[PDB]
């Protein structure tokens, strides 16, 4: 459960990253 | 780092969605003003020890959920927070083999 929560937080933060990357591209 | 291929981008959506995932959402739990040791200074109260062992305590022994189904820490809760077919899956908190 807690590992899933950490992975979900990391994926949420990555979400920001991939979105912005796509935009600049 | 260019990426951005329709295929490369499409893989990203599936991988990210899999890790993450009518309300069927857990019952809201409010303020906890009396904590068992510091907040209420009720350390070793026998009722509390009896309640944790057999009674349903909303946050000490389990998660209430909506629809009334009660999920204990060992059990895995399947719930559907978004209004979509895909359902979030809280694996067991304790996972004692």
């Amino acid at each position: 459960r807690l590992t899933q929560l950490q992975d979900a937080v990391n994926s949420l933060a990555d979400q920001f990253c991939n979105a912005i990357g796509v935009l600049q591209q | 780092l260019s990426r951005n291929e329709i295929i490369q981008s499409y893989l990203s959506r599936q991988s990210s969605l899999l890790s993450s995932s009518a309300r069927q959402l857990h019952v809201l739990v409010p303020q906890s003003p009396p904590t068992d040791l510091p907040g209420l200074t009720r350390e070793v109260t026998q009722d509390d020890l009896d309640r944790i062992q057999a009674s349903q305590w909303p946050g000490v022994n389990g998660c209430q959920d909506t629809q009334g189904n009660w999920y204990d820490w060992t059990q895995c809760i399947s719930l559907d927070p978004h209004g979509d077919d895909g359902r979030l899956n809280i694996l067991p908190y304790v996972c004692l083999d």
């Binding site: 979105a19 912005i20 935009l23 600049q24 | -």
Partner: protein
């Protein structure tokens, strides 16, 4: 103004010298001699007049001029490239703003508290 006229006179003197060399012995060699002397004197004048001014053009402008093209060519291509670049970054920013507005609508649909706090931000 005067420097351009001096350059045009030098070009005309060069054309006249070329025509005299290409033509016949009858053409007065003393005439071409006086023409070359006057051209040298005018160049010394072109210099003295243009010895303390401007100081700029540190660009491949010379390469474009020597690249069989005028500013009416290489400079136009450079300006078009700059315009394409500036139009593209504006499209970038506009698409970013659109995606931000979409996610703002979605997060407003998600939490009313977030709606209130972003209304306070706006």
């Amino acid at each position: 103004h005067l420097e351009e006229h001096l350059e045009k006179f030098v070009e005309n003197i060069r054309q006249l010298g070329i025509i005299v060399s290409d033509f016949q012995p009858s053409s007065q060699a003393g005439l071409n001699q006086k023409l070359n002397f006057i051209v040298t004197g005018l160049q010394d004048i072109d210099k003295c007049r243009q010895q303390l001014h401007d100081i700029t053009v540190p660009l491949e402008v010379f390469e474009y001029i020597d690249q069989g093209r005028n500013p009416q060519l290489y400079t136009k291509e450079c300006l078009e490239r700059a315009l394409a670049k500036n139009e593209q970054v504006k499209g970038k920013i506009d698409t970013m703003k659109k995606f931000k507005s979409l996610l703002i609508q979605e997060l407003s649909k998600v939490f009313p508290e977030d709606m209130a706090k972003y209304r306070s931000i706006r």
